[PDB]
Amino acid sequence: TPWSKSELVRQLRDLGVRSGDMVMPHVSLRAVGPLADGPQTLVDALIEAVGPTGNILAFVSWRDSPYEQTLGHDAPPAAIAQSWPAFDPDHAPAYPGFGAINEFIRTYPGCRRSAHPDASMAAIGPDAAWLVAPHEMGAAYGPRSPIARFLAHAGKILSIGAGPDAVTALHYAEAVARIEGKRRVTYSMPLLREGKRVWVTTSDWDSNGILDEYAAPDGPDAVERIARDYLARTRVAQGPVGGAQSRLIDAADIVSFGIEWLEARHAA
């Protein structure tokens, strides 16, 4: 029997989501199982659970981000540069690999979208505009990003069947960790500025592993290692949402733990 919105809302309440909360979801729709009206049922349930004063923030990215195609170059390669679509926050689809729910979130009426094409974040609620801007190239997940503001806004990370690798906020810990050997990447994104496409090349922390030992293609990366340790060490509300084992994590606490975890293991 497909899960109804009301059932999901009651499950979210049982897990500890309260009216007014600031929630960042990471969802495995396969784990959740069939929904009465598809993924929108869970989006609607999340919005109802946080209520009209609550907020949702999601890391949605962009289906067509030219990350791999520009990585490591000081400028976009010529063929990429000529024909790639500029990122248009109103129309650019979300990246499927971070969750199929994200396209439903980003298309929800009133959703706001951040300007960073690769790190794009979507937000719903009264504080959405404050969450999503600024979001500048060179500030993907660290200071001055939407994640930074989420962490200052009592954020909760709602993992619905997602693994420990899924915790985007822990890229903030990587950004600020006082450790030697941190990896950086250079890439280029096509932005709209006053209606025109402008290529911007930037560097930022490597979000595929902050040190060499965390940068294997298949992992585990530092986010996964930190989150697994944290979850083995901390009381965290656990329970079902749909068919999915879910957890509700204090974001500031896990990020503080992650900064300490990295700094304990790696010389300054």
Ligand X SMILES: NC[C@H]1O[C@H](O[C@H]2[C@H](O)[C@@H](O[C@H]3O[C@H](CO)[C@@H](O)[C@H](N)[C@H]3O)[C@H](N)C[C@@H]2N)[C@H](N)C[C@@H]1O
Binding site for ligand X (CB under 6 A): 61, 65, 67-68, 118, 165, 207-209, 219, 221, 223-224
The annotation status of 229 as a binding-site residue, yes or no, is no
The annotation status of 135 as a binding-site residue, yes or no, is no
Residue 4 beta carbon to ligand X: minimum distance, rounded to whole angstroms: 30
Q: Is 18 helix (H, G, I), strand (E, B) or coil?
A: coil
The annotation status of 26 as a binding-site residue, yes or no, is yes
Minimum CB distance to ligand X smaller for 180 or for 218 = 218
The annotation status of 127 as a binding-site residue, yes or no, is yes
Q: How far is residue 5's CA from residue 7's CA, in Å, rounded to a whole number? A: 5
Q: Is 266 exposed, middle or buried (0-12, 13-18, 19+ CB in 10 A)?
A: middle
Q: What are phi and psi of 131, to 5 degrees?
A: -70, -45
Minimum CB distance to ligand X smaller for 18 or for 63 = 63
Helix (H) or strand (E) run with residue 197 in it: strand 196-205
- 51-61 burial, b at 16+ Cβ within 10 Å, e below that, comes to eeebbbbbbbb
Minimum CB distance to ligand X smaller for 223 or for 244 = 223
Residue nearest to ligand X as judged by C-beta position: 165
Minimum CB distance to ligand X smaller for 118 or for 127 = 118
Residue 109 beta carbon to ligand X: minimum distance, rounded to whole angstroms: 26
Known binding-site positions: 26-30, 100, 127, 168, 171
